[PDB]
Design an enzyme around this catalytic site. Sequence first.
Site, PDB file in Angstrom:
ATOM      1  N   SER A   3       0.831  -1.009   0.139  1.00  0.00           N
ATOM      2  CA  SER A   3       0.015   0.047  -0.058  1.00  0.00           C
ATOM      3  C   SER A   3       0.794   1.146   0.062  1.00  0.00           C
ATOM      4  O   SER A   3       1.892   1.352  -0.962  1.00  0.00           O
ATOM      5  CB  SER A   3      -0.721  -0.206   1.460  1.00  0.00           C
ATOM      6  OG  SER A   3      -2.163   0.453   1.339  1.00  0.00           O
ATOM      7  N   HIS A  40      -8.123  -5.345  -1.364  1.00  0.00           N
ATOM      8  CA  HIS A  40      -6.770  -4.517  -0.774  1.00  0.00           C
ATOM      9  C   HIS A  40      -6.161  -5.014   0.297  1.00  0.00           C
ATOM     10  O   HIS A  40      -5.051  -4.961   0.766  1.00  0.00           O
ATOM     11  CB  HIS A  40      -6.989  -3.192  -0.541  1.00  0.00           C
ATOM     12  CG  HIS A  40      -5.615  -2.270  -0.469  1.00  0.00           C
ATOM     13  ND1 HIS A  40      -4.778  -2.112  -1.184  1.00  0.00           N
ATOM     14  CD2 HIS A  40      -5.310  -1.709   0.700  1.00  0.00           C
ATOM     15  CE1 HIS A  40      -3.730  -1.369  -0.746  1.00  0.00           C
ATOM     16  NE2 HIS A  40      -4.257  -1.114   0.398  1.00  0.00           N
ATOM     17  N   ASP A  44      -8.618  -4.307  -6.478  1.00  0.00           N
ATOM     18  CA  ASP A  44      -8.018  -3.683  -5.574  1.00  0.00           C
ATOM     19  C   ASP A  44      -7.901  -2.204  -6.261  1.00  0.00           C
ATOM     20  O   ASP A  44      -6.942  -2.044  -7.137  1.00  0.00           O
ATOM     21  CB  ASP A  44      -6.811  -4.200  -5.236  1.00  0.00           C
ATOM     22  CG  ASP A  44      -5.946  -3.354  -4.248  1.00  0.00           C
ATOM     23  OD1 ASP A  44      -6.338  -2.374  -3.795  1.00  0.00           O
ATOM     24  OD2 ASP A  44      -4.654  -4.059  -3.789  1.00  0.00           O
TER      25      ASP A  44
END
Length: 197
Positions: free
Chosen positions: A104, A172, A159
């Site tokens: 991320s 995600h 995602d």
Amino acid sequence: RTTRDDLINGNSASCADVIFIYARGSTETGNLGTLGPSIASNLESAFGKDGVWIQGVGGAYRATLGDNALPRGTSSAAIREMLGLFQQANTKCPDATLIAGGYSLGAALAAASIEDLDSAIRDKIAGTVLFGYTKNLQNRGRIPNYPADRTKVFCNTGDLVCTGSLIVAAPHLAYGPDARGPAPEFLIEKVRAVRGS
């Protein structure tokens, strides 16, 4: 478990052969978060506790959700923080092969660091893995200035951060399997392709 500082704590006279520097996702704890321990355990199996130092990016990387909106998908203070761990690696242990990873915001931090790194340290990173890479569409699946064959990106269907957005949907949060098998496998394979120290 979630905090590992093997490079900061490590004795230079006893350098490991492989050093992994990992940056965690938004709001995660310690400096490894939810994916970092899994990968770390498997690298330790491949090379032994003393053959691999696992170092998470802590210090100024706060992993604040809001910094995903910044120009490089992370704060400049976090880029300076990871950049300094790559430079500590190269100075403490010059013969060590480096590997890197991020999730991320830490995948955007790992790409921004590697893009700014001195070329002679960058070339020492035998493989990098990025999970839910927020700059995937923007950077077309690559880390700038870094070979495509040394990069592996895990972007799940659905995602949204992989497809140019910053909405956190369920895919995600679903990278546990990858962090447990494919990603340590890619890293161990890239390190054995060049070798260790």
